[PDB]
Amino acid sequence: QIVHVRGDSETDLEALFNAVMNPKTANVPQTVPMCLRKLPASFCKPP
């Protein structure tokens, strides 16, 4: 196996969580929530 880990992976991983734990402080991109997107109804309803 060959593995390419980006420069700030530790920072980046932390950013993943305080994006939700500290939303007004985190300087991270925002997105339309998946369950609000034009996707099949099954997408957020487990079988």
């Binding site: 880990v5 991983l13 997105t31 099949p40 079988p47």
Partner: protein, 206 residues
Amino acid sequence: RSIGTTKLRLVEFSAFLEQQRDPDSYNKHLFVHIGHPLLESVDIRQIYDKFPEKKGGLKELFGKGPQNAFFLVKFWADLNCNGAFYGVTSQYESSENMTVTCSTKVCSFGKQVVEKVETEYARFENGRFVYRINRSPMCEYMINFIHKLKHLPEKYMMNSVLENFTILLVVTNRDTQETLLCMACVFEVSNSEHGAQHHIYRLVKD
């Protein structure tokens, strides 16, 4: 309802944690698994922002085709779990003898943060060519990610975090650089009693 084409099929995929408490005790927990009547489709424009769109990104790969090789898998991950090894095992089959390149990209906020690259050779089994990636170790990012996710008080917070986390799996014919399979992966945390679940969608142009 399968992830595959006439040239390559994903037969089995599973991500797991193995624990060996003592020499007589073994435990294995599956986070997600595939493989153990018509597929719904998904407009791929609805997910382009979820994956890297530089050179070699999903949009470029999809434009090159073949578009029937492209899938979106929605996972409900089983994080209900208590010497430890985190790993991924997968199996592919083909009618053709190939050397295969398997690229697994972990993406956060639609940007690649980790890429694992594995090369696999065919074995002829049961009348066709088979590709096995056995106990591939999870990168440190994934292991630390699962840990942090688990430390969160409630499941809905985990889901909120997973909004920004995706995995892109691309399998390539090494000789021709042809795309054999591409799997775009999105995650929520399971709340069921049967554990991990998933949905498979065909990706289509509009």
